[PDB]
RNA sequence: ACUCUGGUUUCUCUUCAGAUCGCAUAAAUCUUUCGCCUUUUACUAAAGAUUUCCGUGGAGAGGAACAACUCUGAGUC
RNA sequence: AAGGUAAGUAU
């Protein structure tokens, strides 16, 4: 039932009446504690800050180099979306919901005719030339 | 053994360049300065037994974290079920390979600490202590069998055997007996220390993951990126705040356009706006370029010898068929426009040679199918 | 003699009043702020432009007239459109949509036009098979580029002396050219086998890689 | 382009799965921005038109609805749980976790066959059902 | 022979790495090939590019501890 | 490490 508000005060896991899909142990997780977690996170950040700056700079340089070779998907049509708004309101409103250079074949026809004429002329020398009726 | 260990040494010597321009952030010193820990002085054996108890507590919580009593880890760091575990219970009580590695390394450190403990508490003399240290350092593969826990560790243990191979060889070089009396554990001890130093980042990362609360796509990725980007651009241009339904129908034309490119059939929609048609043309040209590129790339991968799946092979075959059909189309069109390539009087000369050869053969040409035939 | 004879023979000069127009992502307020900051102000480039580089239009994704092959022949005025069409170019590969506003001031006596049919797509480099459709006769692009320069460029009737067209697939491809002796006007193909070929024989039908013309 | 219905709220997905009758509710857990999950969503969109009579697909976001992440151990991308007839079915396809399909199907027809087999098993009343195609091997060779 | 000259142990803190950072040597991910191949944990074994990881140096800063003993060069000596 | 939980039924 998409588009409906969720009545609060009820636990979705318990109200539905489901059973814990214990696939495998050690695969799921299953204030003083908050202060300790903050302290340990600060220690982890301090440990990680040993190489953060140089790694970030190198990653930024590599990403910038990669962008020049091939930009994002929307970059190839940034001009198009810039000019996309130029379409009138009545244009997309009536969108259907349902789903010089002469005849270049003339040269080929002339070549084929010349070849056929030459072959017909050469057919005279064919003493044993035969046909059907 | 000497040749293999020389190979290991030369491979170590080849790749040796540190980029590590660190900020000298002493994480250990920061942990020491943390209020959650304190400093003191104690004997090394006391620290060893403390670490053994801490590791047992670690494995105890890691095992009975989900209140599961199926698997029990003994004080000797050997896991053992409390009964004949049920198959469903066996699936419930399962741990990863890195947990196997952690249990093995805890077993190794615990056994080393206990060996020093029994040495200190009289028992066996120090010469045999050194000999047992040497053996354990050079027989962890046999003692713990890290093979399954980690394939790479096999390299360490095998080279440890190689170093021991040399150690015993020299120790028992002369008057010294050819028995097990060899005491040069440092040579394998340093190798195990180095391998443990390499391993410990993985164990720390996984232990942090547990301690926290959060314990074929490339072509599909690019296709999804193309379609999502074009849809987002349309929804930016098309005022979703006013018109809602038709935008979804817009996607239909997308697919239509795409198949209109695949079938190589004309595609003209006068109802659609001209800028919309231009955007569709850009989308379809990009999609066709990418599609042909990946088609020929996957065809090259298949023909080279790379292993491919049945659905992938069928899709690549379909794409190749479409591409070849298109290519034959413009080839036939180019032949029609440029005319036959048989040079003037050249095909005539070939025909004259053929008819002269036939006249030399002097055979009766095949006539029309007669009313009466032999068979 | 800094001006080399080879360079000065085909030097040229384009007074491209290049404008650093705001990026498309910039809204109307940002565009107005940039205009007040003279971001989109036209700045003369004074580009050397030794050889003109005229790019063919977009290739036909879907063939409408003849499904087998659609050839969108580009009129020769597209090259002559550089007076205003290039002056109306507001496109760049960078984040900011640079307005080129190209304007060729001084046209060199030798005009070397490069079609640049080959272009790299997101995956592979492809060539537009659009026909050249460039007649070999007098031209007036120099007058269009600068009306006052017609007095300086009295001999605006430039004939395409030598046209070279690529052929075959982009990977395994070759080239063939046709050149006309100055004065004599033989207009013969330079290919060793086809030494004498005066008539165009749909010369403009193929994707001419480059053309060279003399002001005369 | 991920136009399938999505559960904005976690409890909404719960009542949507509860509000089922003679139909299979394929709840695809994950994130749309993931590339493999994008491929899975595209496959589900392709299937949706053909089997909309009995198969309804209703995507959800783990970040939007994290309460169900720990319920069925949702810690992988592309996860699919055929929560049909208010009963989590046991779909066995030669894998260790026979209640979760956590990778995009190579072909649409295979997914259609799987979902119709799931529908047949659910209608029969059995809580477990096997797959005609085992996925213990990827048939790489 | 005369005047100024002025510490080294340390503890941490913040930077930069030149220098075989280290006269030792691991591991992880990604990438191309090789044995591949039965799906991932994985591998085999080399190359390529990162990252973590044990450590270190330079340089600077702040307290403690020998800060009063000067070391020492300069000061025509 | 694994790729080896039958489901059903009320307690
Ligand atoms: O199994 P291998 O690697 O081939 O070596 C073992 C063994 O080694 P482990 O103790 O590592 O099992 C002995 O070596 P030490 O007892 O000396 O340590 C033994 O050697 P000794 O006979 O010298 O005791 C003997 O080697 P060998 O009989 O060749 O000397 C034997 O090798 P084999 O299994 O080839 O007999």
mmCIF file of N, CA and C (backbone and C1' of nucleotides) in Angstrom, chain B residues 87-88 90-91 94-96, chain F residues 1-7:
data_model
loop_
_atom_site.group_PDB
_atom_site.id
_atom_site.type_symbol
_atom_site.label_atom_id
_atom_site.label_comp_id
_atom_site.label_asym_id
_atom_site.label_seq_id
_atom_site.Cartn_x
_atom_site.Cartn_y
_atom_site.Cartn_z
ATOM 1 N N UNK B 87 22.106 -30.755 11.972
ATOM 2 C CA UNK B 87 22.495 -30.112 10.720
ATOM 3 C C UNK B 87 22.031 -28.661 10.681
ATOM 4 N N UNK B 88 20.793 -28.402 11.109
ATOM 5 C CA UNK B 88 20.334 -27.023 11.236
ATOM 6 C C UNK B 88 21.155 -26.271 12.274
ATOM 7 N N UNK B 90 24.232 -27.047 13.044
ATOM 8 C CA UNK B 90 25.545 -26.881 12.431
ATOM 9 C C UNK B 90 25.576 -25.659 11.523
ATOM 10 N N UNK B 91 24.520 -25.462 10.728
ATOM 11 C CA UNK B 91 24.434 -24.259 9.908
ATOM 12 C C UNK B 91 24.338 -23.009 10.773
ATOM 13 N N UNK B 94 28.274 -21.469 12.642
ATOM 14 C CA UNK B 94 29.306 -21.447 11.617
ATOM 15 C C UNK B 94 30.053 -20.125 11.689
ATOM 16 N N UNK B 95 31.370 -20.184 11.499
ATOM 17 C CA UNK B 95 32.225 -19.009 11.564
ATOM 18 C C UNK B 95 33.082 -18.926 10.310
ATOM 19 N N UNK B 96 33.516 -17.711 9.990
ATOM 20 C CA UNK B 96 34.273 -17.479 8.777
ATOM 21 C C UNK B 96 35.711 -17.957 8.871
ATOM 22 P P A F 1 36.449 -26.286 5.440
ATOM 23 O "O5'" A F 1 35.376 -25.550 6.358
ATOM 24 C "C5'" A F 1 35.766 -24.875 7.546
ATOM 25 C "C4'" A F 1 35.223 -23.470 7.577
ATOM 26 C "C3'" A F 1 33.803 -23.305 7.057
ATOM 27 O "O3'" A F 1 32.818 -23.628 8.023
ATOM 28 C "C1'" A F 1 35.192 -21.681 6.060
ATOM 29 P P A F 2 32.152 -25.090 8.029
ATOM 30 O "O5'" A F 2 32.402 -25.624 6.549
ATOM 31 C "C5'" A F 2 31.318 -25.986 5.709
ATOM 32 C "C4'" A F 2 30.752 -24.789 4.988
ATOM 33 C "C3'" A F 2 29.845 -25.089 3.806
ATOM 34 O "O3'" A F 2 28.523 -25.425 4.184
ATOM 35 C "C1'" A F 2 31.411 -23.446 3.182
ATOM 36 P P G F 3 27.745 -26.600 3.414
ATOM 37 O "O5'" G F 3 27.631 -26.073 1.917
ATOM 38 C "C5'" G F 3 26.808 -24.962 1.596
ATOM 39 C "C4'" G F 3 26.801 -24.687 0.113
ATOM 40 C "C3'" G F 3 26.522 -25.881 -0.785
ATOM 41 O "O3'" G F 3 25.147 -26.198 -0.885
ATOM 42 C "C1'" G F 3 28.390 -24.712 -1.610
ATOM 43 P P G F 4 24.697 -27.712 -1.173
ATOM 44 O "O5'" G F 4 23.651 -28.030 -0.018
ATOM 45 C "C5'" G F 4 24.025 -27.935 1.353
ATOM 46 C "C4'" G F 4 23.435 -29.060 2.164
ATOM 47 C "C3'" G F 4 23.221 -28.757 3.646
ATOM 48 O "O3'" G F 4 22.060 -29.454 4.098
ATOM 49 C "C1'" G F 4 24.655 -30.610 3.425
ATOM 50 P P U F 5 20.592 -28.928 3.708
ATOM 51 O "O5'" U F 5 19.885 -28.705 5.115
ATOM 52 C "C5'" U F 5 20.598 -28.117 6.197
ATOM 53 C "C4'" U F 5 19.726 -27.958 7.416
ATOM 54 C "C3'" U F 5 18.256 -28.303 7.206
ATOM 55 O "O3'" U F 5 17.714 -28.822 8.418
ATOM 56 C "C1'" U F 5 18.454 -26.025 7.807
ATOM 57 P P A F 6 17.116 -30.312 8.456
ATOM 58 O "O5'" A F 6 15.617 -30.130 7.955
ATOM 59 C "C5'" A F 6 15.027 -31.065 7.067
ATOM 60 C "C4'" A F 6 14.329 -30.369 5.926
ATOM 61 C "C3'" A F 6 13.164 -29.469 6.311
ATOM 62 O "O3'" A F 6 13.580 -28.186 6.746
ATOM 63 C "C1'" A F 6 12.512 -30.872 4.532
ATOM 64 P P A F 7 12.575 -27.253 7.583
ATOM 65 O "O5'" A F 7 11.638 -26.607 6.469
ATOM 66 C "C5'" A F 7 10.354 -26.102 6.802
ATOM 67 C "C4'" A F 7 9.329 -26.484 5.765
ATOM 68 C "C3'" A F 7 7.881 -26.455 6.226
ATOM 69 O "O3'" A F 7 7.315 -25.157 6.205
ATOM 70 C "C1'" A F 7 8.301 -28.493 5.124
#
